Every structure is written in structure tokens, then in C-alpha cells.
Amino acid sequence: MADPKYADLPGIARNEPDVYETSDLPLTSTSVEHIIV
Amino acid sequence: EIPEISLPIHPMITNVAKQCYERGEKPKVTDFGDKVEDPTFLNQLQSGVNRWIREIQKVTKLDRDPASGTALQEISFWLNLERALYRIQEKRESPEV
Amino acid sequence: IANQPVVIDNGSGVIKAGFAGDQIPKYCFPNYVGRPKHVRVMAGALEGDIFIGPKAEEHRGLLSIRYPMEHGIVKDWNDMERIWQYVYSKDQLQTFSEEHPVLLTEAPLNPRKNRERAAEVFFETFNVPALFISMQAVLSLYATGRTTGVVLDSGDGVTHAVPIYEGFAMPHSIMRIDIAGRDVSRFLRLYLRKEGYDFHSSSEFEIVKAIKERACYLSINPQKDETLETEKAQYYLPDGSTIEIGPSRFRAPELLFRPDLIGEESEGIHEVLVFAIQKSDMDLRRTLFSNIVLSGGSTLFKGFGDRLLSEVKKLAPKDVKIRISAPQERLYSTWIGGSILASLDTFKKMWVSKKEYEEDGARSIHRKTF
Amino acid sequence: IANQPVVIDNGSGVIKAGFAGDQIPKYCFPNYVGRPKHVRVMAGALEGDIFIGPKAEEHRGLLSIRYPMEHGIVKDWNDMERIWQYVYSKDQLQTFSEEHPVLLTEAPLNPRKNRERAAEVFFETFNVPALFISMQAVLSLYATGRTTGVVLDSGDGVTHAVPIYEGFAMPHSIMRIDIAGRDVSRFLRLYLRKEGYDFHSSSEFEIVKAIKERACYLSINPQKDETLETEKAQYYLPDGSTIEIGPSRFRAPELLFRPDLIGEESEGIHEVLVFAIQKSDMDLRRTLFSNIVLSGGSTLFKGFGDRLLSEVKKLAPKDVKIRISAPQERLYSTWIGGSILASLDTFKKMWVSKKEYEEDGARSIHRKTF
Numbered sequence: 001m002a003d004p005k006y007a008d009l010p011g012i013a014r015n016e017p018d019v020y021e022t023s024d025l026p027l028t029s030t031s032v033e034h035i036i037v
Numbered sequence: 038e039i040p041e042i043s044l045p046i047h048p049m050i051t052n053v054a055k056q057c058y059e060r061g062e063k064p065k066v067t068d069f070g071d072k073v074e075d076p077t078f079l080n081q082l083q084s085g086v087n088r089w090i091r092e093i094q095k096v097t098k099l100d101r102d103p104a105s106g107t108a109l110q111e112i113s114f115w116l117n118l119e120r121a122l123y124r125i126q127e128k129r130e131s132p133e134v
Numbered sequence: 135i136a137n138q139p140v141v142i143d144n145g146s147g148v149i150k151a152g153f154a155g156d157q158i159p160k161y162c163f164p165n166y167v168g169r170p171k172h173v174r175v176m177a178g179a180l181e182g183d184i185f186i187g188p189k190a191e192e193h194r195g196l197l198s199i200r201y202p203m204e205h206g207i208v209k210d211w212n213d214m215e216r217i218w219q220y221v222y223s224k225d226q227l228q229t230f231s232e233e234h235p236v237l238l239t240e241a242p243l244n245p246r247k248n249r250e251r252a253a254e255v256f257f258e259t260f261n262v263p264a265l266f267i268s269m270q271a272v273l274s275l276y277a278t279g280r281t282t283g284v285v286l287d288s289g290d291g292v293t294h295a296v297p298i299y300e301g302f303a304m305p306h307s308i309m310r311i312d313i314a315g316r317d318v319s320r321f322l323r324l325y326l327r328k329e330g331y332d333f334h335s336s337s338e339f340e341i342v343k344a345i346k347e348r349a350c351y352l353s354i355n356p357q358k359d360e361t362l363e364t365e366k367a368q369y370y371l372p373d374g375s376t377i378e379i380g381p382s383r384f385r386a387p388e389l390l391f392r393p394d395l396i397g398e399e400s401e402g403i404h405e406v407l408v409f410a411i412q413k414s415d416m417d418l419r420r421t422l423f424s425n426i427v428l429s430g431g432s433t434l435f436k437g438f439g440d441r442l443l444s445e446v447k448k449l450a451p452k453d454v455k456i457r458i459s460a461p462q463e464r465l466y467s468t469w470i471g472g473s474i475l476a477s478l479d480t481f482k483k484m485w486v487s488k489k490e491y492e493e494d495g496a497r498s499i500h501r502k503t504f
Numbered sequence: 505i506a507n508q509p510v511v512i513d514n515g516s517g518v519i520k521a522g523f524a525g526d527q528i529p530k531y532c533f534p535n536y537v538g539r540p541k542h543v544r545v546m547a548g549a550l551e552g553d554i555f556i557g558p559k560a561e562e563h564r565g566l567l568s569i570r571y572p573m574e575h576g577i578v579k580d581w582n583d584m585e586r587i588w589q590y591v592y593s594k595d596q597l598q599t600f601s602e603e604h605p606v607l608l609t610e611a612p613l614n615p616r617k618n619r620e621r622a623a624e625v626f627f628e629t630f631n632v633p634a635l636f637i638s639m640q641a642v643l644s645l646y647a648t649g650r651t652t653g654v655v656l657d658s659g660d661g662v663t664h665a666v667p668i669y670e671g672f673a674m675p676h677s678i679m680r681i682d683i684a685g686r687d688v689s690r691f692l693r694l695y696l697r698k699e700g701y702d703f704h705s706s707s708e709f710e711i712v713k714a715i716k717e718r719a720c721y722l723s724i725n726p727q728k729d730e731t732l733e734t735e736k737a738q739y740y741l742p743d744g745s746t747i748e749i750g751p752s753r754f755r756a757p758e759l760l761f762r763p764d765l766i767g768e769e770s771e772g773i774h775e776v777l778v779f780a781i782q783k784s785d786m787d788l789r790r791t792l793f794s795n796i797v798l799s800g801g802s803t804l805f806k807g808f809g810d811r812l813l814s815e816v817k818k819l820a821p822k823d824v825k826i827r828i829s830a831p832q833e834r835l836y837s838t839w840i841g842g843s844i845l846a847s848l849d850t851f852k853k854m855w856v857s858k859k860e861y862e863e864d865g866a867r868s869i870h871r872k873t874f
């Protein structure tokens with residue numbers, strides 16, 4: 001964090017969303033036989 | 038008989054941890070409220086974890102002389118190192134640390 | 135004496151293991167070894183070089199996945215040692231290789247050196263109390279419960295048919311070709327290139343395997359379907375792209391029935407079955423045609439059994455009841471058979487002791503190979 | 505001999521330096537050498553012929569500014585030497601150039617000569633005990649906690665994209681264009697000339713920078729504000745004059761997204777990142793799209809995050825989740841990462857000793873480049 005540290009330097013941008021994000025959203029058979037008569 | 042090191046923890050953390058223990062609830066960062074933002078508290082924590090690293094280095098950089106000494110000392114040596122590091126990792130993996 | 139036998143089913147593509155007596159193999163993972171390709175720069179990176187199992191599967195992008203076994207023959211023994219050693223790690227078994235006799239599945243007609251060096255690996259680096267190398271078809275029939283019948287398997291690197299009569303696996307009727315699952319995936323990769331989509335990275339060949347496992351089928355009529363334009367279903371990559379396959383989904387597993395597409399004088403699966411049955415005693419042909427068991431992961435394609443029936447009917451003599459069974463554990467057939475075999479009291483007399491191996495040597499293994 | 509290594513962020517726009525372990529860089533003065541323009545007549549005037557940092561920022565009008573480093577490549581070595589001497593001077597660090605290890609960052613893909621001459625300066629003019637040259641991407645990951653990500657920094661001179669996954673950097677996927685903050689300021693100057701306000705002196709060039717940092721934003725769409733011909737927001741100058749701008753506080757920063765405006769075929773910053781991700785492995789796309797790190801001062805424009813998201817969203821395949829981590833320390837991320845890395849002990853193994861360089865030379869630096 002270090003909030004006063006950010007008060008020291010001049011480039012730290014406050015009141016900007018820190019994270020930009022995209023929206024979110026909510027084997028075979030057996031006995032195959034064949035007789036023949 | 039390789040020494041053991043009991044890694045200290047910040048007592049306030051243990052206070053809130055025991056408070057999380059009196060009720061059925063897992064301890065988490067959100068429980069400290071506006072205490073995480075304290076640079077004094079975090080500076081204390083940084084110092085404590087730095088001391089932890091010092092203590093663990095005191096055990097991990099350890100080694101003996103394979104040339105001299107009795108062989109039994111070496112066998113017992115490696116076993117004692119496994120015991121030390123095993124207890125160390127269990128102290129590390131605790132939810133408080 | 136030891137604790138319990140560990141049935142380690144090998145496979146050129148997927149190794150499968152667990153203790154004997156278990157119901158299903160609890161530990162199954164691909165038989166590959168992945169080591170990173172990129173450069174370790176940032177500290178705190180993925181420590182360790184060689185990765186096997188779920189961790190190698192997870193961080194698949196970094197690895198340069200290779201196979202140590204191909205066509206049921208080990209090409210690199212170091213990677214196999216690390217794989218077996220991984221089987222005995224804390225992630226899979228959490229045991230020691232000193233208190234467990236080992237049942238080991240192995241494909242037929244393989245070189246003697248496989249059994250010899252594999253035995254050296256176990257009894258020397260692992261120092262197992264007892265090793266027992268066996269076939270795979272015998273185990274699959276033991277897993278189904280019946281006893282006489284052929285076994286048609288097609289794993290990842292081999293495929294063969296073994297006519298088993300009450301346990302005595304007839305050694306003079308084991309046809310064996312080397313066209314299996316991995317090779318079908320390889321030919322599928324070639325067809326994907328011909329489609330336009332290129333996949334050539336070693337960690338992308340696995341994506342080709344995934345496509346083979348969930349987007350291919352077997353056409354009943356092999357040519358009538360080729361003369362038509364299919365619906366060309368899509369496919370979602372792990373990357374998120376889209377691949378329309380088209381005709382490259384039914385001709386890809388067509389290789390198993392015609393290895394002319396790969397350019398080889400071998401035979402199809404149907405010819406392996408018919409030749410395995412016909413190169414046997416004429417008094418057992420009807421019994422073998424009435425009992426066919428499939429196993430191995432390559433027998434999981436859609437329309438596989440039905441096409442196999444059609445092909446065999448075209449090759450079997452007229453009015454002979456053909457019967458192909460297909461249990462639900464074709465991936466676990468050899469392992470379940472190993473669990474049944476090694477859990478018996480006769481297994482004590484069926485293995486090879488460590489003492490015996492130290493006395494005679496590899497000749498003791500070839501002596502008691504069955 | 506070593507005590508608290510000196511981290512130096514050798515950036516072409518502003519040099520950030522301090523000791524290791526410091527959570528914040530204590531000295532961040534701009535990277536230029538200020539020489540006077542007007543003769544000294546009156547005795548007792550300002551002393552010296554070289555003004556650096558705080559003095560060359562208050563008496564800016566009296567000076568002529570010469571940037572030493574341009575596009576991450578040093579032009580006048582004399583000037584860089586003087587700036588480094590200023591760093592070790594009394595007003596900045598009061599240390600000697602022989603008692604502390606030095607971590608000096610560098611942009612990726614710089615020529616070998618920069619590494620060679622940089623170490624020659626730090627090993628000949630300065631008798632530094634230990635020197636380590638790094639990447640300006642890994643350090644941002646360190647100072648942001650992550651270990652897997654795409655570092656998209658845009659310093660004042662060179663922007664690039666480095667995809668790092670689990671601590672492993674994929675060097676062939678590094679994309680790098682030499683179009684950043686300098687070009688934006690210079691192009692803003694040309695827009696002011698088209699709006700009737702000229703600036704030609706070097707001392708007034710920083711007033712153009714001041715305009716950029718205090719009044720430039722990025723529209724979410726390139727044409728929804730283009731033909732609108734919006735209002736002319738005024739902006740005061742350091743004397744008390746007045747500048748109204750209008751179509752230049754958004755037209756000047758679109759040079760990063762399309763450098764065709766400057767007359768140079770290349771790729772925009774969004775294409776830099778998207779091509780750096782797409783050049784990586786097939787399995788690693790989703791993790792790189794969900795782990796995008798920003799750094800560099802040019803990534804502080806208003807609406808920069810929204811534009812970067814929408815451009816990547818247009819170029820990425822559908823429904824892929826795109827997360828862009830944008831910390832508040834985009835200017836000091838690389839430095840804080842340097843303070844972290846130099847505070848470790850693996851750094852001791854990673855640097856180069858003086859005798860190492862004496863016995864080897866440039867070869868030792870190219871060996872430990874990664």
C-alpha cells in the first residue's frame with residue numbers, strides 16, 4: 001500500500017480504476033453381436 | 038542434536054485468530070478491518086517475516102564435514118535435518134504464518 | 135513376502151497403476167515426459183526441470199513433451215525410470231519400491247531386451263521383491279470373467295489380437311501390427327495440415343490427440359461418406375479459436391482399417407482378427423468368433439464396433455455367429471485384469487523372486503515368462 | 505565489499521534510483537543534461553556548466569536540454585556518465601561507486617554495445633563491485649506479486665510486450681516498437697503548430713510534456729470525437745499565457761495506437777501486445793489474456809485502460825476473459841521490482857564480479873543477460 005509514499009512521488013494516479021476487465025458470463029455400448037444362420 | 042527454531046507471530050494476529058476460533062470461522066485478511074492499512078503494523082510484520090527468513094537460513098545453510106567425523110554422525114545428521122525441516126515446514130504452512 | 139502387489143499397467147500413451155485388489159486404477163496419467171522449453175528468468179519460477187503427471191499437463195505450454203515408449207518399446211530408459219519413480223512418488227503412491235511385488239503388463243512380440251532391461255530397472259534401482267511381466271490380452275479376458283476367446287486391443291502404440299484358450303494364450307496366432315492411437319493422431323495431424331490448420335509443436339500434438347478423442351468417428355460405409363460433404367462441425371481450441379474439420383474426421387481413424395493411407399503393407403484391424411482366428415485350430419474357430427473382446431483406448435471411436443462387425447462379416451465364412459463384446463472398461467481392462475490376477479494366492483508362485491533373479495538372471499525371467 | 509545495492513532504473517525519460525530494500529525510489533529526476541545558453545556576466549551567478557535534475561528543473565528557461573538516451577539507446581556517453589555521477593553525488597546519494605552493487609535496468613532487444621559500454625562505464629569510470637543488467641518486464645511482475653503475465657510497458661522512449669509465464673520468459677514472443685512518450689510529446693508539438701502555437705526550444709519542449717501530462721486523454725472511439733470538433737479547453741502556461749487546444753488533447757495520444765500518423769508503418773501498442781500473446785504457445789493464451797500488466801509512464805493517459813481493453817477485445821478471440829492489471833505505481837513498478845530483486849540473496853549469484861569482467865569482458869555480460 002504505502003499511501004504517504006504515493007503522496008511523495010507525483011506519478012501515482014489516484015481515483016482511476018486499478019483493474020480493467022472484460023465482463024463475465026454465468027464410452028460406447030457392449031455386446032454388439034450379429035448372429036448368422 | 039540440531040537446534041530448533043520457534044518462529045514468532047504477531048500477537049495481534051493471534052488475538053484475531055483466536056477470535057476467529059471462538060466462533061466457527063476461518064481467519065482471513067478482511068477480519069482486520071482498517072488495520073491492514075496501518076504502515077506501522079505492516080512494518081512490524083515485515084520485520085517479523087524478515088527475522089523468520091534469518092532463522093530458517095540458520096538451518097537450511099547448515100552442513101557438516103563428510104570427510105572427518107564418525108559415519109554415525111552423518112547418518113544421524115541427515116535424519117535430524119529432515120526432522121528440523123519437517124517441523125519448519127509445518128510451522129510455515131500453518132494458517133497464521 | 136511384501137505388502138501388496140502393485141499393478142502398473144504400462145502403455146505407450148497412458149500409464150495406469152494402483153495396488154492389486156483395487157476396483158479401478160486410482161492413478162492414471164499420460165506416459166510422456168515434459169521438460170521446459172523457455173528460459174528461467176524470474177525467480178520463484180516453476181522449480182525443477184522434468185515434469186510428469188498432472189503438473190506436466192497443467193503447464194503444458196512450457197513443456198517440450200516427448201514419449202519414452204513407442205510401439206510398446208521403450209526408446210529412452212531414463213525417462214521411463216523417472217516415470218516409474220514418479221509412480222512411486224508422493225503424488226501417486228506414497229510408498230516404497232521395496233515392499234511391493236510388481237505386476238507389469240507388457241505387449242506381445244516385443245524384444246527380449248524390454249523384459250531384460252525393465253527387470254534390471256525394477257530389481258536394481260527399485261529393488262522390488264518380486265517382478266512379474268505378463269501379456270495384456272490374458273489380463274483383459276480375466277477382467278471380463280470369461281475364459282476362451284480372442285482379444286482385440288489397440289492402445290496407443292500397438293494393436294494385436296490374441297486367441298486365448300482357457301488362459302493358454304496361443305503363441306502361434308498373435309498377429310500384431312504397429313498402427314495404434316498415437317499413429318492415428320499423427321495421421322490426423324497430417325490431415326489437419328491438409329485442411330489448412332497447422333499443429334506441429336510437441337505440446338500441440340496433444341491438442342491433436344484431444345481432437346481425436348472428441349471429434350472423430352468411424353463411417354460405416356468408407357467410401358459413400360467420402361463422396362459427400364459433411365456438416366463440418368467446429369472445434370474450440372484451448373486458445374479459444376475455432377477449427378472446422380470437415381472430411382478430416384472420419385478418414386483420420388480410417389487408418390486402422392487400411393494402413394495404405396500411411397503407406398504400409400500391414401493390415402487392418404479386421405484382418406488382424408481374421409488372421410488371428412484362422413491361424414488357429416479349426417476346431418476352435420466358431421468358439422473364437424462367438425467371443426471377441428475389445429480393449430484399449432483406440433476402440434472408443436464412434437461406430438467402431440459396428441464397423442468391425444461389418445468388416446469381420448465380410449471376412450468370416452458364411453453363417454458363423456460373430457460376436458464382439460465391448461465392455462465399459464476398455465481403458466482399464468488390462469489393469470482390472472491385473473488386479474484380479476495378482477490378488478490370487480497362486481500369484482506367490484507365479485512371480486519371480488528377487489533372490490531368483492540374483493541367482494539366474496534374465497534367463498530366469500524368460501524361463502518363467504508365463 | 506557490498507552494503508545495500510544501488511538500483512538504477514535507466515529510463516530514457518526519467519531515471520529512478522535508490523538503494524535496495526527501499527520500498528520507494530528516493531530520487532526520480534529527469535534524464536537530461538542542462539547546459540546554459542546565456543553568457544554569465546554578473547559574478548556570483550549560478551555555478552557549473554552542467555545542471556541535472558532539481559536544479560535543471562527550476563532554472564529550465566536558462567537551459568538547453570540534451571537528452572542523452574533516446575529510444576533506450578545511449579547517444580552521448582559523457583552525458584550518461586555525468587548523470588550517473590550525479591546519482592552518486594552528495595545531493596543524491598553521498599556514496600562511493602565502489603561500495604555498493606548496482607542493478608541497472610535496460611529495455612529488451614537493445615544492441616549489445618549498450619550492454620558492453622554500460623558495463624565499461626560501471627567498471628572503469630566507476631569501480632562498482634557488482635553489476636547486474638536486467639529486463640524491464642520481470643521487475644514489474646516482482647513489484648506486482650504476479651509471476652505469470654504480459655508486461656506491457658510504455659516508457660518515454662520504447663514500448664514492448666514480454667509474455668512471462670510462471671517465471672519463464674518466452675523471448676521469441678517479445679514484440680518491441682520504438683514509439684512512446686517522446687513521440688507523443690513531439691507529435692503534440694506538431695499539433696500545436698497546426699493550432700498556431702510553436703515551440704522549438706529544448707527548454708520549451710518540457711512545456712509540451714507538461715501539456716501532455718496535464719491535458720491529454722484518449723477517446724474510446726477514434727471517430728466519435730474526430731468529426732465532433734469539440735470544445736477548446738484552455739490551459740495555462742508557466743508565464744501566464746493561455747493555450748486552448750481542442751482536437752489535439754486526444755489526437756496526439758492516438759499515435760500509440762496507430763503510428764501511421766507519424767508516417768511509420770509499424771504496429772500499434774495494442775497490436776504489440778496481441779502479437780506478443782499470439783506468438784506464444786497455443787496453451788498459454790488464456791492465462792496471458794487474463795494477466796496483463798501495465799507499466800511505464802505512457803500508460804497513465806486518461807481512458808487508456810478502456811482503449812486498451814477494447815482494442816484487445818477486438819483482436820482477441822471471442823469470449824476470452826481479458827484482465828488488465830493496472831497498478832498505481834506504473835512509473836515506479838520497475839524500480840520497486842529492482843529493489844525487491846536486489847534485496848534477495850540469489851542476486852549475489854546473479855551479478856558479475858569485477859574480476860569476472862576483467863578476465864572475460866563483454867562475454868560475461870551476454871552470458872548473464874537472462
Ligand SMILES: Nc1ncnc2c1ncn2[C@@H]1O[C@H](COP(=O)(O)OP(=O)(O)O)[C@@H](O)[C@H]1O
Nearest residue numbers: 144145146147148289290315347431432434435
Ligand atoms: N475417446 C477416445 N477415442 C479414441 N481414442 C482414444 C479415446 N480416448 C483415448 N484414446 C486413445 O487411446 C489411447 C489409450 O490406450 P492406452 O490405454 O494407452 O493403451 P495402453 O495403455 O495399452 O497403451 C490413448 O493414446 C488415446 O490416444
Ligand SMILES: Nc1ncnc2c1ncn2[C@@H]1O[C@H](COP(=O)(O)OP(=O)(O)O)[C@@H](O)[C@H]1O
Nearest residue numbers: 515516517518659660685717800801802804805
Ligand atoms: N500523469 C501522466 N500521464 C501521462 N503521461 C505521463 C504522465 N506522467 C508521465 N508521463 C509520460 O511518461 C513518461 C514517464 O517516463 P517513463 O514511462 O518512466 O519512461 P521510462 O520508463 O523510460 O523511465 C514521461 O516522460 C511522460 O512522457
